[PDB]
Amino acid sequence: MLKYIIPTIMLMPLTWLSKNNMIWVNSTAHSLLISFTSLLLMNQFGDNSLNFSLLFFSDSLSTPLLILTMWLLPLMLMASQHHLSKENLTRKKLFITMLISLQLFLIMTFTAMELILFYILFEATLVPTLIIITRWGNQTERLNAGLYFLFYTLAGSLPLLVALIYIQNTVGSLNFLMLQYWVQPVHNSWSNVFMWLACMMAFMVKMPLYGLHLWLPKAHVEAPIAGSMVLAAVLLKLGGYGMLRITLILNPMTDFMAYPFIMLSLWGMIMTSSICLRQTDLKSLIAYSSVSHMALVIVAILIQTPWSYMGATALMIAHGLTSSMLFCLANSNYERIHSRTMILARGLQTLLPLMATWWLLASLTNLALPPTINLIGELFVVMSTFSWSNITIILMGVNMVITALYSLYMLIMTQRGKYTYHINNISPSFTRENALMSLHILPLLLLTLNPKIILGPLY
Amino acid sequence: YLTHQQKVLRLYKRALRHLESWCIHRDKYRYFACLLRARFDEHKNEKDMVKATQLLREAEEEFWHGQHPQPYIFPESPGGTSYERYECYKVPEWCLDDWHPSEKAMYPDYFAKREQWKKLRRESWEREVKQLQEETPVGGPRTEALPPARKQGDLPPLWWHIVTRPRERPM
Amino acid sequence: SWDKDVYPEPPRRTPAPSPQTSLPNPITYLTKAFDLLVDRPVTLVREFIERQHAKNKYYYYHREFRRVPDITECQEKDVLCMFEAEMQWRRDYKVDQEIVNIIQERLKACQQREGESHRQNCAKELEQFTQVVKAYQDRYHDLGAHYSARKCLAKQKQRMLAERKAAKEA
Amino acid sequence: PLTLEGIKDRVLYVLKLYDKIDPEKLSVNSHFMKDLGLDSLDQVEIIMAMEDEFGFEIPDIDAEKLMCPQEIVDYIADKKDVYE
Amino acid sequence: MNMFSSLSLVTLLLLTMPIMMMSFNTYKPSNYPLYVKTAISYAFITSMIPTMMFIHSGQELIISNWHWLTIQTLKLSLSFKMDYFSMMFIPVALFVTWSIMEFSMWYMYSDPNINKFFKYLLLFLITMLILVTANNLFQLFIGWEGVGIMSFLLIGWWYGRADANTAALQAILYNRIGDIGFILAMAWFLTNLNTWDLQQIFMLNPSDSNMPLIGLALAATGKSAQFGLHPWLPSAMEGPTPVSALLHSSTMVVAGIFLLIRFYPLTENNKYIQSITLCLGAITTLFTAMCALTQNDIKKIIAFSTSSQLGLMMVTIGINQPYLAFLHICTHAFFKAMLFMCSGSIIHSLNDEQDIRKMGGLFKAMPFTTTALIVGSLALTGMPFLTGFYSKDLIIEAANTSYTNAWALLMTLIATSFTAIYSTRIIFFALLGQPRFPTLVNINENNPLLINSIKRLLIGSLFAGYIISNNIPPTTIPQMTMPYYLKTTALIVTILGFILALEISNMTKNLKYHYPSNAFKFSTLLGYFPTIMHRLAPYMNLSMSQK
Amino acid sequence: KMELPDYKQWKIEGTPLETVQEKLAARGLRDPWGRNEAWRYMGGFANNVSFVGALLKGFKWGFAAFVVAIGAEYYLESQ
Amino acid sequence: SGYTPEEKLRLQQLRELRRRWLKDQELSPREPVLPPNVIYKTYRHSIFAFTHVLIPVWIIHYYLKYHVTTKPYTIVEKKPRIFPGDTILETGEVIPPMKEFPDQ
Amino acid sequence: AHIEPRYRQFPQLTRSQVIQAEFFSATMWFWILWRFWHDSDAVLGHFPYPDPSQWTDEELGIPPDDE
């Protein structure tokens, strides 16, 4: 993994040593080259994973998440440079440096063998994240509202640290390869119930789980576009990636300890989709859309069948590209009207014809139109949870109806109908914006031709 | 809000249009249109406005009972089949500003005439703002009506978006 | 092209044309038009390509995996022996998925081939599909997403205990 | 395609087929109530006939104010974007 | 098989070529609509060669050409089932689409987005041919949702109109409710069997098939707008007339019936699902026919005519006659697509007037539109030996002599009589009488695109039923022995419907003052299903969201 | 650019609009818009087929073609 | 109940401008200034058949004959119907007739 | 515009549309009569329907009431 760590670090000298007017050109060009070389990680095997060294490994789960992470850095740079153009030069380089350091922690996080090494990096990603959201965020409101920092660290980060420390004492190691052979069953015990919650609550909050999700809409309304892109696309998948790994050592206690979280996810899947129908803020609508989609991933991970793990991996990648594109589409409107209200500017298809095509494609993938990988992932989770209990088809089906409703409602409200009379500064879509959208959707649709490389290790 | 005189005439028009929806055939409609007209004529010269109001209220109750479930609606009227059919084709004039110079090079006469209008709008705006302020009582307007241009050379205040509104069949 | 024993097909019996109408058969005429305008030009192009291929002849091989001790012979917590047995079990699991796929493809090919007589003429294919699916279910069903040789063996021993017990009951 | 003269001709045409109007006393500037001595119930009927003539509705708020053929001609011309 | 299979795929591949050429390959936006019509016309010719081979020797194939994905023991491939139903449906749909596209070349002439309109019709056709030829449930799902989205994009064509956006989103809502049944079948077949292939499903032939077949019945209920999920089809009239012609004949609405025909080897041996689809169809065929009696919009009447005929198709499925249900899909596509093209010809002449109360006196004014409308109306109402008689007549005979629900049979016969009433209603108010339209007459049906497009469907509406019914092979034993009063039931109630409708129409001329009725308001307002459901259901959901 | 037909043609006499006027004159009323509807009942729009007439369109020539076809079918039998 | 004297005057003044504006939407004769019989129908159709039928079937036939059909069970025929009295091409076999029908 | 719009009058027609409308109206009636002549059974009945009250006890194998 040093062939990706070292070039990523070298983006920092490159950014600080570029000519003043070349910082965006230089970093975007070279970060796209790192993204190109990330495709060499797809040297996967049917039986073994790609174990590079004592610290890092890659398997079919982390590999697609790594490629998505490395793809997103150039896209974030393209999306950020317009609104940072009035920023002074030293602050543009610090902003770029935060994004590079965020990628450095993410690629290391997804490949760490040792779960304690994963924990330190899994938390180090918050330092660049909060700095980006707060220092370049919209308002004076605190994303780390204090209550959320306390609840998360007390009920999430700290219990996970103690559980991991406890596990290594008992097992003698937290290397994930070792945990595959030395795993022992978890018997019923009040102490074991608390180990289970400790091992899972941190990832539940980051997913987020329904009932622990109110932080996510607040963060999106405050974050800059790059913040929303990384947060939606990857940072939520850190919780999903963590659960897919740590559930190896939690059986068979997950057989019953998962019921409350499945209930929260199955019900919260419908409650958050319905909320999307009465959202007045695009960024909030997309944020609640992510909660609904990540409810499927939690259910898939907790019932742990081969089909649900394949569906979970596909869902995480598909949502990453789709939710990121939706935030970029909303941001482009915001950069003209300077408001997140969804009802303010209407009938935009009349004024921006091609951008309306990007909107339609983003909405069709969001509502899981076949054969997009959005549906492939969602169908697999639906197929698996039907076996878990046939009644779930009712809740899964109803959510499919509602998801189509708010996806097209968002498309209809903003793109169709009569345009707003007094808004007279809607300039034609820039090449930068059109290319930003097409770099989201083309890879998303091309993956329909070869879905196996996003189906994870269970494939 | 309306006068009594307006409510009756609105009920006469609405009554006729629903009667036309029931009758369908022009001769049958013309027969009952004169029967209906006669009913109004029977009470044209009433003077007791208490009776006149009670006559109107009973008429409107009668209308609601005899109302047609599916009255005919002109295609382009609110609720008709063509209502707002061409809104997707109406592009506001300010969009021409953002045209590329190569796009404007295709219509040199049209765009020359368009700067003449934009010049006229500029030179007129200050005068329009004064005329409204001087003619406007203290406390703001009492109604939405707007005045005409008073002098030769002036343009009626607030005219651009009325004059340059999209055609009703833009494409 | 493929192996006829693995993907069997019965001998084809096509009845001879026995026309009983003076009208020309437009299908036979379109067949000649196809055999002339489409097949022969296509065949010429392919034959040229296959000539280039014959000039350059190189070979690829089917990887052979020597057998190693199973998980039943590994020492507890001996990862070095558990690793090789675990990889071997995964390879066999992947192969067994494709053995079931071959049997399903035979069943589906049979149904289409037999037309309206498939219920009687595909009973052998149905029986074979039934037994293979049963054997696959016995091995690998209900192991979970975190399956392994260890959990496969635990399932087997549990099944072996139930079989042994019902023998006493008999 | 409508023209300002074609709208005029059809407006007057419809009025000349009204039995309450003298076709010799009718001109584009003939006020319905002051000149022709019609009532406000007749004015409603006249406007209804123009809606049928041209196939679109004139809302009651606008219809009240059309008290001569020329005003009707101007109203129809404006809604239809006729200019020559 | 080399010629049969090659020509089977070129037809599909050919239809996608105008889509690929949209990437500016010798692009000639001057006449893209003409290019699309030509591709359909050539696609019709090539599709007729496999059809002849099937007619000849019953040759059928599966083409599983591309292996897409394997999920352990579930191999997914791009597989086309080129069988009885695909052989005969594809030429009909291509023939009908060819006429609708030539008609659209004239109807949509002034639309600035003419090219985009034709691209959407081509995609709307492609997703239907993915549906019919699909050989596994996943590929069937791609087409199933494909038509749904194109329905949304074409119903909401005029996107500045809020009513158009509301009808487009209504189609999606009601159709995705039906898709709960589709995924339920997919989940059941994957779990209880181990396949989404139709071949392995029929080979295993489960007896405990209530759950997967209730899922398919629900999926067909929404897509083909049976009672319960039906209001969206009338609402879909917001789209341009050429959209309604395709929607109501050779694409979306028959997909629900087609799905249940595909699975007849399962519904054969399930008397419970047969009883559900019989009753489900029987109420639909009557209820929608009753609604059409009092409608005044010409597009609404034809739209309810479709729901009533789709109800009769669902009845045919429920009396265990799937091959007659298919024969009705084929024949119905001819005269139903024509009726929409005749309404559009009238609507266009009268300057976008769709209300029959403002029509009249068109019998001589529009002679060729009148001829096609009369032929179309007689074909719809089962006039002997026209295209509609070869399916409707056999369906009523087969329903009469089956071990059937008695109430469903009576409701099916009354709906047949009502068919003659609203068909008369269109002819009487649109063509007979004196003109009731504005005074500036722009009636002009003299356009070769309009004449030729309607003429080809008129020829189909005369001979298509006879030609098809004489070429398809027997798959059942038609029951031909039966009492006279059961043999002639369909013709008799059709004739009494015509007689009973003349009296009702003529009383509209008497100088008598009507009196509204509870029955009249019930039929006019569509039984109040939209008014109650479309207000109450959104209210409960939307108010629930905020709190 | 367009020529409106002379307005004095339009008289309600001979149409059902005259039946309407007679029925209204019994009640002491009159129909002032009668001539504005008269064009719908005159000259080309005056006489319209009935429903049975609409269905029987082209029957006369269909039957003439039918008698010749079956006759020509029988002439080919005796031969 | 008619227009007030100011209402008529404002309407008249907006009529002049609105009608002048619409007159100005007309295009000049030069605008837009752009930058720089059986055989015909047969050639258009002949070239269409070649590009949109012959080439596609060449590619499809090549694909099916040499890439699809060379893999097992990719194109599965329904076996032809054999009726009594037939002659099998592959073997030369002769299917016997059916029993003599009873009179009917 | 080869057809001029008219005011309050019956529209101008062409011969081509009137002749084609009549040809296809007469085709429909020829077809109905031609088929009814040759396939009248499809409308009235293909085969006789027996009256079961006529079948004798001998042929239905009904034993005598005292056997």
Ligand SMILES: CCCCCCCCCCCCO[C@@H]1O[C@H](CO)[C@@H](O[C@H]2O[C@H](CO)[C@@H](O)[C@H](O)[C@H]2O)[C@H](O)[C@H]1O
């Ligand atoms: C889209 C463009 C992508 C560009 C990059 C990928 C293209 C690379 C193509 C190189 C393929 C060469 O593949 C190579 O072919 C030669 C053909 O003699 C073979 O060569 C070998 O084969 C046989 C015997 O083994 C002999 O004919 C030959 O003497 C021997 O050297 C190699 O065993 C094979 O590996």
Ligand SMILES: CCCCCCCCCCCCO[C@@H]1O[C@H](CO)[C@@H](O[C@H]2O[C@H](CO)[C@@H](O)[C@H](O)[C@H]2O)[C@H](O)[C@H]1O
């Ligand atoms: C799966 C592989 C498929 C390989 C296909 C290879 C491409 C072969 C096509 C090359 C020629 C395509 O030509 C494309 O289609 C027709 C051909 O007449 C053209 O269209 C032309 O004919 C139509 C009617 O016939 C006219 O309406 C149109 O005005 C005219 O330009 C398109 O403007 C052109 O872009």
